[PDB]
Symmetry: C2
Subunit: 207 residues, 2 copies
């Protein structure tokens, strides 16, 4: 469980038009700019790992991150054991993985904060199509996305191939109540799941 | 530290455990007035039906015109301290309650997290994210009278009945809470996937008229 956990997904979809103008992120700007810390919902006292790769592809900006913080993984491990959702396990093929499943359930989205400053794991991203996919092997995670080509993965593989977490369970729990009041949280996540062709039938995605 | 102390003071919670005017689709959730009044020592108060998460006790239970109403008291020092620490790391709580009300981090976190009531078969009363029976909105407050007053359906007669009960030292209490922050965190992801959580909660609030009053309810 405490072993590293990889997370991948789109930080932005070019064909997607943001609601707020501030979330506009065109291809040329992204390509022009192309390690970023990985934190929990933009709280820089909650860094859990780092972005291990970023690739601008046909449909958007894809990234792969690695959750390495032992403190964070341990807190997650303990919490996962007290989750009814986690206890239900994944769908038929995949084998149970409490930590990966808790992470899939709690932080189902990605959020690129451009103050690029950091990638935050959050309950749902503010940009659509930013579903977060967790797994123990980065190849497997990248393979969860149909839009990526072999050439796309080669570029990503080339990249990914003191505990920074200064928060606690209390902080994560305080974050959880905020998550319950995010409007259209599940519909957004399902929309994202649809847009990137990821199913619960071949991943740990809970939405 | 002084305010920190107030935060961990007792929290009362009130609301209907069942609405006689609501017909549930599932038979296991049926709870008729005659059955309630017949069955009608303090019941334990727990978090989402977890025996290892008892946070207090029920201080009053009353069958009134519109359903079964109950009042409970959250007393566990450990649970309250956990909640206090988490409440300070919540954007929702930072925004505060509707104007006139005094901010109360602990009361607000409880109002946001465990907005529903769920009566288990009487064995216990559980604070949950949303109850399976409709109209089971949970209302938190520092004083029993105030909480009871948030419900327009209760008459002066109804309150006098409840009051007599809570003014009356339970067997539930040292600290009965045998869980921790990790336990509550684990449970919080479960709540994120309950279907139509917010709509149900808004329907509940309007059904019991808590909308017509001002409270710490976040839904």
């Amino acid at each position: 469980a405490v072993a590293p956990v990889y997370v991948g997904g789109f930080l932005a979809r070019y064909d997607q038009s943001p609601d707020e103008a501030e979330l506009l992120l065109p291809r040329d700007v992204v390509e022009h700019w192309l390690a970023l810390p990985l934190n929990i919902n933009h709280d820089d006292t909650a860094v859990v790992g780092h972005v291990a790769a970023m690739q601008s592809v046909r449909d958007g900006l894809f990234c792969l991150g690695c959750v390495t913080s032992p403190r964070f993984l341990e807190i997650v491990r303990r919490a996962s054991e007290k989750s009814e959702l986690v206890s239900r396990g994944p769908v038929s093929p995949l084998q149970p993985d409490k930590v990966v499943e808790f992470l899939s359930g709690s932080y189902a989205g990605l959020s690129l904060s451009s103050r690029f400053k950091a990638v935050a794991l959050c309950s749902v991203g503010r940009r659509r199509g930013t579903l977060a996919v967790y797994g123990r092997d980065p190849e497997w995670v990248t393979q969860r996305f149909p839009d990526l080509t072999a050439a796309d993965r080669d570029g990503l593989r080339a990249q990914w191939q003191g505990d920074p977490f200064r928060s606690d369970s209390y902080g994560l729990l305080g974050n959880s109540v905020d998550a319950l009041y995010i409007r259209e949280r599940l519909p957004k996540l399902r929309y994202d799941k649809q847009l990137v062709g990821v199913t619960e039938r071949e991943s740990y995605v809970k939405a």
